[PDB]
């Protein structure tokens, strides 16, 4: 047995009635001095290291050529001057197993944490030495963490894309379905997760050029996409991950949901394709009144009205669709559909739930389009325009397919450094650079929307870690007060940085003038309502850091109206799965699942206590399954009001609660303004 995992297993050996949490420091120390320093390739000087990495196709020469070697040396000194030490064995293990650069035979270790951070910072700065040092300080202090694609691939030659979330709109044609399959395979080949909207596709039993009952529905396209994602699996190390989204008023909604039933046949069930359901407020209203709802055939609506069903407002056109004889509709029970959704989430965790009117009542770019679906992680909520891929000889009408670069603030380290403003602005700059350097040459709509929208996603993590290490319960009103103030400040500084970038570059995102930022309606609750902490305990947490007031928000509103905004979307809170270990942080803004997390890697068993877990804060680290999901919904809705995109909201369910409890949680989330619900995790 390895010495470091033997030391790491001494955490669970209870001495004097307490877990030996200090063993993890010894565990990581032994891990380093017995595996990492031994397996680390060391060069005489940094120049030899960089030459070796560039020559052997490990790094990219173009980005390293913008700095003189003295500047690169200064950046590396800045990284190593911090003398960063991993606080736990899991942090270092995850870094050196997932993100640290290794030789071509996966034998030795080329990059330390400081080397990777310095390379990412030099990639972000794009020739600026001082900006590179600022990025080094930001990441070595672990105030900001670039997403897994960016952190893993920044500055590497044989790399995937820095963006891993893509959203595709599929038009109701065979050419568009073929192009969707092709683009899905191309993006899965790049390593990204692809989400597809299947609402515009006509339902099963619709006509294909005046021959009736000819269309196979969305389930045939679902099978096509599932096999396309199985094919493009990148060695199978990380198999192709796709998501399909369907509006709840699509006729194929029941067959769409039946693809996830355990008793589904092999000719229907999809395995590699996650599913999400988009629910307008009309469906919730119909289920609330116990009235008879109707699902519609999309092609009939398109023929009758000239627009797709999901491109229309269901809360204003549902009655017109029902009364229209030329529209084909099927009678359903909305409460039965809700119960089926709850049962499917209990048994499989699917579908993802998107509350469409919750997304679009606060959506800033409804002039471009309404948000019709989310991503594979169920937190990207941006306007999309469907493309019209025509025959080979004809020109294609390229729409807007969503993609944003992810990045997380570490709430604990940002709050410790009293650096919300600087961290948010530097992270915004880094995400802007990642957006600018991304060029997808096989997804035309993704490329066009990346150039036009310039959307970024700046998330946060370690919310529960910060609260538990500060003696605040996750369900407590003080926690929601802190989240309100913190994320209002993050929104303020992200909007300020976007406006400053627009002023400097002299350009805004496409169709900015129609957005709510340009009209000033976005800032109504910010110029009217003060978001300063209401509790003295929370107010001391922000001591030494200026909290923008209503006057500051009015000044920012004037600044945005006079200079514009560079990013259509700025903030989205992703799950942040594996980078949470490296940053020694709790995953996303969701509460922790286990206080001490037990994992098996190969034939070795190791335990990961939550960051900062001890006996003085053991009960503040309440597990997500033991807490009220209504209070978690309250917390996420408090955070969501300052986030322009969505939040990956996992529901943590006990075995005792029925499908009625899951439905009640979903309805309370819809009532409280929750935009999306990610997973129904059951213990």
């Amino acid at each position: 047995v390895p010495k470091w995992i033997q030391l790491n297993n001494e955490i669970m050996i209870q001495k004097d009635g307490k877990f030996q949490f200090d063993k993890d420091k010894e565990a990581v120390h032994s891990y380093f001095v017995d595996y990492i320093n031994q397996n680390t390739v060391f060069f005489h000087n940094l120049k030899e290291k960089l030459d070796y990495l560039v020559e052997n196709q490990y790094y990219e020469e173009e980005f390293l050529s913008l700095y003189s070697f003295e500047d690169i040396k200064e950046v590396f000194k800045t990284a190593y001057a911090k003398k960063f030490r991993f606080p736990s064995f899991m942090s270092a293990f995850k870094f050196y197993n997932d993100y640290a650069l290794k030789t071509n035979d996966k034998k030795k270790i080329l990059e330390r944490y400081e080397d990777r951070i310095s390379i990412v910072a030099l990639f972000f700065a794009n020739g600026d030495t001082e900006k590179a040092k600022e990025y080094v300080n930001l990441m070595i202090n672990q105030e900001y963490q670039p997403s897994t694609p960016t952190f893993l691939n920044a500055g590497r030659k044989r790399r995937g894309e820095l963006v891993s979330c893509f959203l595709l709109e599929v038009n109701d044609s065979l050419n568009d379905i073929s192009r969707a399959i092709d683009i899905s395979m191309q993006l899965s080949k790049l390593g990204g997760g692809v989400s597809l909207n299947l609402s515009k596709l006509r339902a099963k039993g619709e006509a294909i050029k005046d021959v009736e009952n000819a269309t196979k529905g969305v389930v045939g396209v679902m099978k096509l996409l599932d096999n396309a994602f199985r094919y493009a699996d990148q060695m199978g190390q990380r198999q192709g991950s796709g998501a399909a989204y369907l509006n709840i008023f699509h006729r194929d909604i029941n067959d769409f949901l039946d693809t996830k039933k355990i008793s589904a046949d092999e000719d229907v069930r999809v395995k590699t394709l996650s599913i999400g359901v988009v629910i307008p407020d009309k469906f919730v209203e119909l289920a609330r009144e116990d009235k008879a709802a109707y699902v519609f055939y999309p092609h009939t609506i398109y023929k009758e009205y000239g627009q797709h069903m999901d491109e229309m407002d269901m809360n204003e056109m549902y009655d017109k669709f029902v009364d229209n004889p030329r529209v084909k509709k099927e009678k359903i029970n909305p409460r039965k559909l809700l119960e089926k959704l709850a049962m499917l989430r209990s048994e499989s965790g699917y579908p993802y739930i998107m509350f469409q009117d919750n997304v679009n009542k606060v959506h800033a770019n409804n002039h471009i389009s309404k948000v019709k679906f989310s991503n594979l992680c169920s937190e990207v909520l941006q306007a999309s325009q469907v493309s019209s891929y025509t025959d080979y000889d004809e020109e294609d009408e390229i729409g807007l397919d969503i993609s944003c670069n992810l990045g997380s603030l570490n709430i604990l380290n940002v709050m410790e450094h009293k650096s919300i403003e600087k961290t948010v602005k530097l992270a915004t700059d880094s995400l802007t650079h990642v957006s600018e350097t991304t060029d997808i040459r096989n997804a035309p709509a993704v490329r066009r929307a990346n150039k036009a929208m310039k959307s970024i996603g700046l998330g946060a993590m370690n919310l529960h870690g910060y609260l538990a290490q500060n003696g605040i319960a996750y369900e407590s009103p003080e926690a929601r007060d802190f989240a309100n103030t913190f994320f209002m400040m993050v929104n303020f500084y992200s909007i300020q940085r976007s406006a400053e970038i627009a002023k400097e570059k002299g350009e805004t995102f496409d169709q900015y003038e129609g957005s709510t930022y340009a009209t000033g309606e976005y800032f109504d609750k910010y110029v009217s309502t003060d978001f300063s902490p209401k509790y003295e305990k929370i107010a001391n947490l922000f001591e030494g850091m200026h909290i923008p007031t209503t006057e500051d928000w009015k000044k920012l509103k004037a600044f945005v109206a006079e200079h514009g905004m560079y990013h259509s979307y700025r903030l989205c809170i992703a799950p942040t799965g594996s980078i949470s270990y490296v940053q020694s942080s709790t995953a996303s803004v969701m509460p922790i699942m286990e206080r001490i997390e037990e994992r098996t890697y190969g034939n070795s068993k190791t335990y990961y206590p939550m960051p900062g877990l001890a006996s003085n804060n053991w009960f503040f680290y309440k597990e997500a399954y033991d807490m009220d999901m209504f209070k978690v919904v309250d917390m996420i809705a408090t955070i969501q009001q300052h986030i322009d995109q969505g939040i990956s909201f996992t529901l943590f369910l006990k075995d005792t609660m029925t499908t009625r409890d899951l439905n009640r949680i979903d309805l309370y989330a819809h009532h409280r303004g929750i935009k999306t619900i990610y997973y129904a995790r059951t213990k």
Partner: protein, 289 residues
């Protein structure tokens, strides 16, 4: 006073061999000696034969002669388990671990093995001797069935349990434990029906029925000894298995309401170690907060 609770227990124990994936035993099987694999195949083949006849003949015939729709439902369910679940599970094990030729050979071996033929002849003979409305012939067949359920299977069960207890062949062992769990309740149930008939008799008749039961047990026992030696001598376990079958013979007698016949002995401790979310409808008040 008991059929309903046996009905509920039997139906709640329902299972299929396909629920257990068997490819996990592939390596621990590969690692056994040729002698061990031979004994194992033959042991399970002997079990397959017993369950084949218990399902085809024993349980259906007893069901035919026992009065009461609920008693018949329990016996019919037990019959189904014998041939549709138990006997078939052995083929699942064989098809995983062994090549077709070895499977063919072991089924040929059951046909020509004299101890296995003798025990089948004796048990099935008693089943087929049942006369309508003749409770004594029925009692005799129920004694035979209890001896099959609670005694005769055990020379076979020993070996899968012996491996399970050492952490070997644990998937096959899981199947066998499920089969054993079923046979234990089958033996108790049929035992209770036999006692019903016995309790109707004069003291003189009872004395004769005890003689029948003990003579039959001894005759089956002597044959089982030879069968046990034939199978287990090559793996060195015959004496241990013999202790196990005597232990279970006492359990069979007890299932029939009789005193234990063999003295207690220490059994191999290895063998002893070998032993959706609820849907609730949404209310109107659930939509308001």
């Amino acid at each position: 006073d008991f059929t309903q609770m046996f009905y509920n227990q039997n139906v709640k124990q329902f299972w299929l061999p396909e629920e257990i994936a068997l490819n996990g035993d592939l390596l621990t099987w590969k690692y056994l000696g040729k002698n061990e694999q031979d004994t194992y195949m033959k042991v399970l083949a002997g079990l397959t034969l017993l369950d084949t006849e218990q399902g085809n003949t024993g349980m259906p015939i007893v069901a035919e002669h026992v009065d009461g729709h609920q008693r018949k439902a329990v016996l019919n369910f037990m019959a189904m388990m014998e041939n549709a679940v138990h006997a078939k599970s052995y083929s699942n094990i064989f098809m995983t671990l062994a090549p077709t030729e070895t499977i063919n050979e072991v089924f040929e071996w059951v046909k020509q093995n004299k101890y296995l033929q003798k025990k089948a002849q004796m048990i099935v003979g008693l089943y087929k001797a049942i006369q309508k409305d003749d409770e004594i012939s029925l009692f005799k067949a129920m004694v035979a069935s209890v001896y099959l359920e609670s005694f005769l299977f055990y020379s076979g069960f020993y070996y899968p349990l012996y491996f399970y207890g050492q952490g070997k062949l644990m998937q096959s062992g899981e199947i066998i434990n499920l089969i054993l769990r079923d046979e234990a309740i089958h033996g108790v149930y049929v035992g209770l029906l036999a006692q019903e008939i016995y309790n109707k008799q004069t003291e003189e008749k009872k004395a004769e029925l005890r003689e029948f039961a003990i003579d039959l047990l001894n005759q089956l026992y002597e044959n089982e000894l030879e069968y046990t030696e034939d199978l287990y001598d090559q793996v060195g376990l015959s004496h241990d298995v013999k202790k196990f079958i005597r232990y279970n013979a006492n359990k069979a007698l007890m299932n029939l309401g009789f005193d234990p016949y063999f003295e207690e002995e220490d059994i191999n401790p290895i063998v002893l170690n070998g032993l959706k979310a609820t849907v609730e409808p949404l209310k109107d008040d659930d939509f308001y907060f």
